[PDB]
Design a protein around this ligand. Structure first.
Ligand SMILES: CCCCCCCCCCCCCCCCCC(=O)OC[C@H](COP(=O)(O)OCCN)OC(=O)CCCCCCCCCCCCCCCCC
Ligand SMILES: CCCCCCCCCCCCCCCCCC(=O)OC[C@H](COP(=O)(O)OCCN)OC(=O)CCCCCCCCCCCCCCCCC
Ligand SMILES: *[C@@H]1O[C@H](CO)[C@@H](O[C@@H]2O[C@H](CO)[C@@H](O)[C@H](O[C@@H]3O[C@H](CO)[C@@H](O)[C@H](O)[C@H]3NC(C)=O)[C@H]2NC(C)=O)[C@H](O)[C@H]1NC(C)=O
Ligand SMILES: *[C@@H]1O[C@H](CO)[C@@H](O[C@@H]2O[C@H](CO)[C@@H](O[C@@H]3O[C@H](CO)[C@@H](O)[C@H](O)[C@@H]3O)[C@H](O)[C@H]2NC(C)=O)[C@H](O)[C@H]1NC(C)=O
Ligand SMILES: *[C@@H]1O[C@H](CO)[C@@H](O[C@@H]2O[C@H](CO)[C@@H](O[C@@H]3O[C@H](CO)[C@@H](O)[C@H](O)[C@@H]3O)[C@H](O)[C@H]2NC(C)=O)[C@H](O)[C@H]1NC(C)=O
Ligand SMILES: *[C@@H]1O[C@H](CO)[C@@H](O[C@@H]2O[C@H](CO)[C@@H](O)[C@H](O)[C@H]2NC(C)=O)[C@H](O)[C@H]1NC(C)=O
Ligand SMILES: *[C@@H]1O[C@H](CO)[C@@H](O[C@@H]2O[C@H](CO)[C@@H](O)[C@H](O)[C@H]2NC(C)=O)[C@H](O)[C@H]1NC(C)=O
Ligand SMILES: CC(=O)N[C@@H]1[C@@H](O)[C@H](O)[C@@H](CO)O[C@H]1O
Ligand SMILES: CC(=O)N[C@@H]1[C@@H](O)[C@H](O)[C@@H](CO)O[C@H]1O
Ligand SMILES: CC(=O)N[C@@H]1[C@@H](O)[C@H](O)[C@@H](CO)O[C@H]1O
Ligand SMILES: CC(=O)N[C@@H]1[C@@H](O)[C@H](O)[C@@H](CO)O[C@H]1O
Ligand SMILES: *[C@@H]1O[C@H](CO)[C@@H](O)[C@H](O)[C@H]1NC(C)=O
Ligand SMILES: *[C@@H]1O[C@H](CO)[C@@H](O)[C@H](O)[C@H]1NC(C)=O
Ligand SMILES: *[C@@H]1O[C@H](CO)[C@@H](O)[C@H](O)[C@H]1NC(C)=O
Ligand SMILES: [Ca+2]
Ligand SMILES: [Ca+2]
Lengths: 973, 49
């Protein structure tokens, strides 16, 4: 085994060889030279990240105040309009004309139900809606089990028809506005503009079971947040059909709950235990509810019935005050069949003043006495609900919000506050969106205070979407580098706006569906959960980020600079990036907005080119017939002008881009000058490289392909044969290697993938990249990332000439940080190239981490898909490992032993690059396995919830809670 | 005991005296007696020892 100085001297002649090959062939110092040679085609402006945040915080203020004004007027009209409605019952005499969504639009149908008359609308196709729509009226959604033509429903479509004039007045004023909808108390919803619903009832074989009342946006503006506590009778009598019904009501009751709502679930049969692991009221987020809905299911019923230990346990649960709580409506609901005891004594003290509200549910078909339960409900200002059937569950476990809304409708105007929802997928397929809601109240005869019998309910709730693609147009990231971004946050820790946030729903648990019990054609529910990713789950968690995260939940302003490690774009690397954060509150709302920058991004380039010939000359550089002397040029699909659209077929896009500058001068009076201009300047900078430097050295021996991925989207792979293999995203702010090249001050090597499809190994090769780094007036800039795809065959020859091509004595390999295998001596390893090195000899890799040579961090990706397990895709959690050098020390000697054998490995790290060289004795001499240490998205179901909630994340609830008005009717059950 | 977790209704049981009287009379006329017996058998696990 060679000495430590021989490995030292032999690494230094093959890290000097790779870097000279990459410093020379790519042209780092040449592209630095021509950015500095000009100085005057551009100027260098600063990103004032105090100022940028303040500017952004105000476009989201004004956007969400403009939405709010529209909401207020609609509400006023609805209140005024229905106070002048007459309650007619002759509807076959005077037809109600409306367009009904989810109905066949074929003219020849003509069903013509009594009372109603439909509309055939004309349906232009649209952008900002990715569906055909009509701007002349509002559609109407009736849920499926609700009959339309009922006097109760027919009378909504009469009075609600005056909203189409106010609907129209909102979009005339603001073209950008998205869905406008009124969700009725009656269960009928009207939205503008009209479009056909996505599931028709019976024209396909999937049938929608969508109810407006059920909806989260409808619920948050229906009522105030609430600490509930589900109390269930588990005595022997319940077992049977009735027990079956309860498990489906509680799961149903929960659907109703929200993040702001706290909830626990207890259960009694002569003792009250608590159904799961929790013991206090927990946040009823997606996870906690998933635990409770998984413990409600396994319940078995036996024993007697004591309504006294069940309500003692409930009240005690209600009084914890140590835990984090909603502290608003306090209510307890019991599911039971029949009661012989009213438990008068427990209610006298625990709730002598009736602070708590009790709702009693009688379920199943049975003969047990319901008088005592009704009495309990009446005594406590709750309500009573029967459920005999499965189809009766859905409208009675949502109906309690008519009771809880009462002291809000007695609060008057004070209760008309806009609230904005958690991001969620739109019913109509719009994408991620948030809705601002306002409740409409039933005011009839207010002038004189004549009735009030049913004047304590809301007419319904009114909402208006903001799409998250609308907010991302108020937070522009182009001036800032790929590293910089804006993050938005609730007072709940959830992230409103984040690079990491994705359309797929956030998943819980490992998905298990039983194929042996899905009959083929019945169509179960798909999903309704909100997409609540948290800030400490969108990014790698620190302790110096939980400080930042708490500090901008409680509405403060500030900046912070620290060293933290960024997870890479692809999930394979972790790079220590020195960042600066800066946050401020959006003053109209409860969102607070932040901005990450990396020091060195504090300055950007603005293009200062305006000459006729210079913008002209740089623009034919990106012509696809002129790639024989330029290099297969790419171009990023920014929204350059409003007219040319991002196309995802890039040769399509670059023609429509470059047609645009010929057919019209780049002045373009409805199109931003700087973004297009910067691109033009850039293409004259990645031209002078490809003309005056790369086309001189037309073939370097080991060099396969040469790229300049730059800022302005223009990536230039140098031979067109090589550009067929360029499998990157052509958007330069989505490339992984672009972003890892900017963090590092040394050449970076990217490992090719293992297996997969497409040619990514011998054909393209392993790639090196390096950020260009210029200084203008003593101000650091990193404009571009040069690079090289390496030839893996040639590199091997230099490497071979104490390791032989076929050596049994000892094997040596080169590994980039992250532990991936790039170059291998054996030839059974270099076939499996770009593979995680702990999968080809897991014994050595395990030891290396122990020596402190390597470090890692497992994280959770709450938005990913996986195949089900037997117990096409669902959402699930994956755990993800990344590996990264944590020790700066250059060399590491030692020996590892498996038991009865030693192997002496020597590790040396090449200077000036992330690569590491290790020499070790052949694996075959000691037959050892430990277990195969693998690095992949690995399906898992963590972290366990029962341990998170003992020390929950900081949170801030709603300031205004409406409950317990003294003059509430409290007489109807 | 006719407390099976199904939504099927079994009107002929022995839950109280009047109902039990009717069921006995029914088994006596022989009308649907086998159906009544099946319920009773299922109330003890099924067709086992
Ligand atoms: C001389 C002859 C000497 C022998 C005479 C015969 C002896 C009869 C002994 C049995 C008599 C028992 C009848 C009295 C009785 O206690 O019936 C109780 C029964 C309870 O039913 P009820 O309270 O109405 O509620 C039904 C739903 N839970 O009430 C009923 O269901 C009544 C049904 C009618 C009975 C015929
Ligand atoms: C004039 C007429 C006067 C007649 C009155 C005399 C009364 C007759 C006494 C019958 C008492 C039967 C006692 C056996 C019994 O109740 O069942 C015990 C056993 C319990 O099992 P268990 O767990 O309850 O149910 C689940 C089964 N895996 O389950 C079993 O083992 C099933 C045994 C039930 C057999 C009942 C026989 C009744 C015969 C009627 C005769 C008339
Ligand atoms: C493997 O090792 C070889 C030899 O060191 C290395 O070589 C290429 O080697 C030749 C041998 O002299 C170099 O001349 C050649 O470099 C160029 O010519 C002169 C030499 O001083 C200088 O201008 C630069 O070194 C460089 N510039 C040129 C010619 O444009 C050198 N480069 C190539 C690729 O031909 C291989 O690169 C090593 N294997 C790799 C690529 O890792
Ligand atoms: C709910 O439906 C009813 C029934 O269609 C609507 O009432 C109708 O309202 C219109 C305009 O308010 C009435 O038109 C007027 O008719 C009189 C003659 O009757 C004429 O003098 C007026 O110049 C005008 O043309 C219509 O007659 C009336 N129908 C009845 C039976 O009274 C009502 O408007 C609908 N509500 C909403 C909010 O849309
Ligand atoms: C808003 O509140 C008002 C009352 O404050 C509600 O109006 C009431 O609606 C009921 C519906 O059951 C009407 O009662 C019906 O009366 C007819 C006679 O026309 C009778 O045939 C029916 O059997 C039933 O009793 C009642 O007339 C009406 N009250 C008033 C004062 O107009 C209204 O329904 C609420 N708004 C919404 C959208 O529900
Ligand atoms: C958000 O609103 C706050 C006030 O509630 C603004 O703070 C003010 O800032 C101005 C100068 O910008 C000062 O003159 C005032 O004294 C500040 N307010 C108070 C009460 O001291 C803040 O500038 C706003 N920020 C944004 C982004 O809109
Ligand atoms: C992420 O990895 C880093 C390794 O660089 C971890 O940081 C070290 O954590 C240990 C305890 O696990 C401390 O003793 C060291 O002082 C830390 N070193 C540095 C440089 O921070 C970090 O804990 C990991 N994060 C997680 C969540 O495991
Ligand atoms: C105590 C009880 O019956 N609860 C069950 C538990 O025993 C079981 O381990 C779990 C998973 O099957 O489901 C629940
Ligand atoms: C298409 C194909 O052959 N895929 C294979 C896969 O079956 C195998 O498990 C893997 C080894 O990691 O190599 C690849
Ligand atoms: C900051 C830190 O931990 N540095 C250590 C260093 O002290 C040690 O010499 C080296 C070799 O083990 O590993 C690293
Ligand atoms: C895995 C292995 O080789 N274990 C060896 C065994 O073969 C040998 O018989 C024994 C005595 O020398 O020592 C140990
Ligand atoms: C808000 O409304 C005003 C007035 O219609 C308009 O000028 C402005 O552009 C709107 N802002 C946003 C972000 O929609
Ligand atoms: C982080 O900050 C220190 C001190 O300002 C600086 O020396 C270092 O270069 C920064 N980190 C990186 C990766 O540049
Ligand atoms: C290093 O390995 C030793 C022996 O296997 C072990 O006791 C120790 O925990 C390891 N160090 C770390 C950091 O895990
Ligand atoms: Ca009972
Ligand atoms: Ca018969």
């Amino acid at each position: 085994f060679p000495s430590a100085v021989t490995i030292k001297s032999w690494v230094d002649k093959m890290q000097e060889d790779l870097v000279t090959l990459a410093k020379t062939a790519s042209g780092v110092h040449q592209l630095v030279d021509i950015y500095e040679k000009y100085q005057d085609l551009y100027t260098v402006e600063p990103n004032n990240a105090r100022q940028l945040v303040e500017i952004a915080a105000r476009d989201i203020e004004k956007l969400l105040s403009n939405r709010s004004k529209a909401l207020v007027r609609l509400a006023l009209e609805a209140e005024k309009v229905q106070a002048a409605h007459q309650w007619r019952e002759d509807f076959a005499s005077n037809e109600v004309v409306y367009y009904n969504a989810k109905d066949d639009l074929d003219p020849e149908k003509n069903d013509s139900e009594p009372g109603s008359q439909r509309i055939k609308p004309v349906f232009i196709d649209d952008a900002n809606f990715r569906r055909q729509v009509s701007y002349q009226h509002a559609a109407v959604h009736i849920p499926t089990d609700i009959y339309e033509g009922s006097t109760i429903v027919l009378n909504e479509l009469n009075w609600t028809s005056a909203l189409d004039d106010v609907f129209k007045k909102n979009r005339e004023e603001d073209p950008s506005l998205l869905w406008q909808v009124f969700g009725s108390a009656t269960g009928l919803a009207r939205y503008y503009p009209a479009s056909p619903w996505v599931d028709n009832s019976r024209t396909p074989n999937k049938i929608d079971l969508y109810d407006v009342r059920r909806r989260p946006w409808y619920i948050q503006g229906a009522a105030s947040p609430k600490d509930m506590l589900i109390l269930v009778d588990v005595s022997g009598s319940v077992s049977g059909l009735t027990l079956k019904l309860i498990r489906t009501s509680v799961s149903e009751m929960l659907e109703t709950l929200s993040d702001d709502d706290f909830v626990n679930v207890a259960s009694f049969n002569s003792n009250a235990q608590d159904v799961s692991c929790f013991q206090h009221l927990v946040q009823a987020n997606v996870r906690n509810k998933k635990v409770l809905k998984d413990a409600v299911n396994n319940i078995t019923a036996k024993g007697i019935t004591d309504y006294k230990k069940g309500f003692s346990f409930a009240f005690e649960q209600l009084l914890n005050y140590n835990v984090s709580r909603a502290n608003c409506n306090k209510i307890i609901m019991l599911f039971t069949d029949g009661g012989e005891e009213r438990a008068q004594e427990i209610f006298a003290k625990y709730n002598k003043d009736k602070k708590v509200r009790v709702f009693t549910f009688s379920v199943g078909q049975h003969n047990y006495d319901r008088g005592p339960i009704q009495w309990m409900a009446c005594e406590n200002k709750g309500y009573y609900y029967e459920i005999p059937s499965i189809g009766a569950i859905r409208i009675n476990t949502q109906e309690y919000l008519d009771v809880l809304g009462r002291p809000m409708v007695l609060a008057g105007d004070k209760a008309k506050q806009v609230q904005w929802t958690n991001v969620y997928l739109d019913a109509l397929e719009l994408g991620l969106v948030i809705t601002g809601t306002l409740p409409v109240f039933n005011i009839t005869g207010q002038f004189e205070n004549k009735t009030n019998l049913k004047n304590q309910l809301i007419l319904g709730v009114m909402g208006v979407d903001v799409s998250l693609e609308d907010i991302k147009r108020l937070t522009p990231r182009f001036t800032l580098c790929p590293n910089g971004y804006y993050f938005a946050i609730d007072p709940n820790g959830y992230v409103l706006l984040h690079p990491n946030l994705q359309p797929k729903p956030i998943g819980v648990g490992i998905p298990t569906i039983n194929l042996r019990k899905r009959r083929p054609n019945v169509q179960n529910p798909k999903s309704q959960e909100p997409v609540t990713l948290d800030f400490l789950d969108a990014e790698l968690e620190n302790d110096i980020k939980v400080e930042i995260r708490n500090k901008m939940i409680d509405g403060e302003s500030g900046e912070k600079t620290f060293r933290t490690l960024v997870k890479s774009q692809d999930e394979r690397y972790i790079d220590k990036g020195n960042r600066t954060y800066t946050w401020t509150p959006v003053n109209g709302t409860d969102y607070s907005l932040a901005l990450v920058l990396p020091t060195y991004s504090f300055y950007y380039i603005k293009a200062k080119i305006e000459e006729t010939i210079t913008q002209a000359r740089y623009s034919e550089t990106l012509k696809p017939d002129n790639f024989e002397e330029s290099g297969y040029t790419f171009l990023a699909p920014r929204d350059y002008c409003s007219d040319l659209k991002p196309s995802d077929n890039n040769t399509e896009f670059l023609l429509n881009f470059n047609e645009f500058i010929d057919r019209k001068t780049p002045n373009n009076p409805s199109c931003n000058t700087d973004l297009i201009n910067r691109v033009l300047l850039d293409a004259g900078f990645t031209n002078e490289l490809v003309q005056n430097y790369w086309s001189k050295q037309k073939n370097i021996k080991g060099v396969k392909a040469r790229f300049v991925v730059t800022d302005g989207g223009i990536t230039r792979v140098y031979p067109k044969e090589a550009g067929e293999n360029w499998q990157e995203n052509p958007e330069t702010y989505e490339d992984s290697f672009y972003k890892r090249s900017l963090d590092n001050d040394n050449y970076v090597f990217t490992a090719p993938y293992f297996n997969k499809s497409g040619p990514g190994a011998y054909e393209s090769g392993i790639m090196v990249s390096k950020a260009v780094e210029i200084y203008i007036q003593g101000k650091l800039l990193k404009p571009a990332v040069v690079g090289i795809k390496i030839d893996v065959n040639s590199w091997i020859e230099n490497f071979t000439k104490d390791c032989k091509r076929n050596s049994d004595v000892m094997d040596c390999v080169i590994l980039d940080d992250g532990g991936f295998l790039l170059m291998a001596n054996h030839d059974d390893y270099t076939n499996q190239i770009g593979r995680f090195f702990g999968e080809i000899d897991p014994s050595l890799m395990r030891h290396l981490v122990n020596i402190s040579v390597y470090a890692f961090n497992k994280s959770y990706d709450y938005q990913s898909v996986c195949e089900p397990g037997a117990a096409s895709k669902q959402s699930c959690i994956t755990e993800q490992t990344q590996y990264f050098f944590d020790n700066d020390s250059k060399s590491f000697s030692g020996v590892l032993d498996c038991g009865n054998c030693s192997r002496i490995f020597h590790v040396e790290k090449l200077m000036n690059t992330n690569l590491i060289f290790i020499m070790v004795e052949s694996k075959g001499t000691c037959p050892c396995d430990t277990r195969l240490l693998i690095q992949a998205e690995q399906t898992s179901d963590g972290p366990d919830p029962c341990d998170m909630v003992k020390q929950p994340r900081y949170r801030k609830g709603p300031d205004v809670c409406f409950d317990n008005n003294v003059l509430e009717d409290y007489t109807d059950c | 005991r006719y407390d099976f977790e199904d939504t099927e209704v079994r009107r002929s049981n022995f839950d109280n005296f009047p109902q039990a009287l009717i069921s006995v009379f029914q088994v006596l006329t022989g009308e649907d007696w086998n159906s009544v017996m099946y319920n009773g058998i299922m109330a003890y696990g099924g067709p086992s020892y």
